[PDB]
Structure formats: structure tokens, C-alpha cells
């Protein structure tokens, strides 16, 4: 299942409407936002294939920062090898369009908050964007939203040692969305089932 055409409703519930460009596939052009905070949810795949995995990009023109929150925190190389996904192009187009000097600071997550069998990627992205909308200079951590979940080194993604941390992250995610999204509340059971912690576990 995962999350489909749902993020929009949830992200709107979370107060991101004034900054949210929408959901895109891997062809996301980038940001043309020299003066305003902006963000987007971006799939690793093209629309042609259905959608594989969700990430969040956010742009702060005042701090000159582009944020990438991909819930597993994979390296660029692992994004290319696991998902055939490259964000160099959209980063370049964003900086050309949005920065007077054609430069930016890329800030990207290096830790996993999501279990390796979880289908909650899209929901984690929604949570990050609430953090961005409310704390645009420190969306990754040290803020009330992201203080609710704990990243672990991406190298330990499949370690039995950290699985309870990642399960608790998912519990906090859902409860976060219960508290802040009427859309989530009214679809609570269906979304939990379609995004569950062991949803993609191999049999």
C-alpha cells in the first residue's frame, strides 16, 4: 500500500499549505523560490512505475539551505544503487533559479527513522514538513516535532538492536498524526494497516 494522494491532505492538515508545492515523482524540477519558504514530497521513481519511496525536499531562501529528508538516510551512492535516484539535477536547477549567487547549502539526513520493512515513508515525510514549516532553520532535529523520533546510523538499518527504536518512531509518528490531522484520524485504521511497521517484511 504505502501512502497515495494522502500526503496532500495530511500536509495541508499540518499547516504546510502556504509552503507546499505538491507531490512529484523523480522528475521534480526543483525550487523557483527566491523569497519564500517552499517544500515538496518527491518519489524515487517515475509516475510510469507507480511510486516506490517518498522523500521530502525543503528550501529556505533566507538561510540559503536546501533540506533533503529521506527517511532511511541513505548516502547518495545508495540512493543511486537502491533506487536509481539522483537529485543533482534538481539541486542545480533550484540553485540557478532561487539563489542570486547560484549557490546553496545542501543539508541531508544521514540517519534512519524508518524500519526496513515499514511502509510509512510518506507519513515520515509529512512529519518532517510540519517541522520545516514551524522551525525552518532547524527542521532535522532540536525541535518539538522531530524530538519525538530518534534516528539511527543508516549502517545499522537492519540490525536487530535498533528495531524497537524504529518501531517506537512509527508509534510516535501515528500518534503525532492523530493529534494534528483530522484526515489521518478519520482514516486512522486504514492508514496504519497500509503503512505498518512490518508491512513489507519478506515471507
Amino acid at each position: 500500500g504505502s501512502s497515495e494522494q494522502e500526503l496532500k491532505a495530511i500536509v495541508k492538515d499540518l499547516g504546510c499549505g502556504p509552503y507546499f508545492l505538491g507531490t512529484y515523482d523523480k522528475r521534480f524540477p526543483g525550487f523557483v523560490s527566491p523569497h519564500k519558504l517552499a517544500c515538496a514530497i518527491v518519489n524515487t521513481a517515475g509516475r510510469e512505475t507507480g511510486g516506490v519511496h517518498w522523500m521530502a525536499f525543503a528550501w529556505n531562501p533566507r538561510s540559503k539551505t536546501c533540506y533533503l529528508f529521506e527517511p532511511f538516510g541513505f548516502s547518495d551512492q545508495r540512493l543511486k544503487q537502491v533506487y536509481q535516484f539522483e537529485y543533482e539535477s534538481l539541486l542545480r536547477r533550484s540553485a540557478i533559479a532561487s539563489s542570486p549567487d547560484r549557490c546553496i547549502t545542501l543539508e541531508k539526513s544521514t540517519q534512519s527513522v524508518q524500519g526496513p520493512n515499514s511502509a510509512a515513508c510518506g507519513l515520515f515525510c509529512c512529519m518532517f514538513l510540519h517541522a520545516f514549516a514551524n522551525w525552518p532553520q532547524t527542521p532535522m532535529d532540536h525541535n518539538p516535532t522531530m524530538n519525538l523520533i530518534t534516528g539511527v546510523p543508516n549502517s545499522m538499518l537492519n540490525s536487530p538492536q535498533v528495531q524497537p527504536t524504529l518501531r517506537r518512531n512509527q508509534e510516535q509518528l501515528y500518534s503525532f498524526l492523530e493529534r494534528h490531522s483530522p484526515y489521518f484520524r478519520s482514516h486512522s485504521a486504514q492508514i496504519r494497516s497500509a503503512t505498518s511497521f512490518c508491512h513489507l517484511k519478506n515471507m
Binding site: 549557490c103 527513522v113 517541522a131
Partner: peptide, 11 residues
């Protein structure tokens, strides 16, 4: 939250 890496990029 998550730790993050920062990279200056110019195009």
C-alpha cells in the same frame, strides 16, 4: 530527530 550532513554547492 536525525543528524544531517551539510555541503556547500555552487552551480
Amino acid at each position: 530527530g536525525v543528524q544531517s550532513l551539510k555541503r556547500r554547492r555552487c552551480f
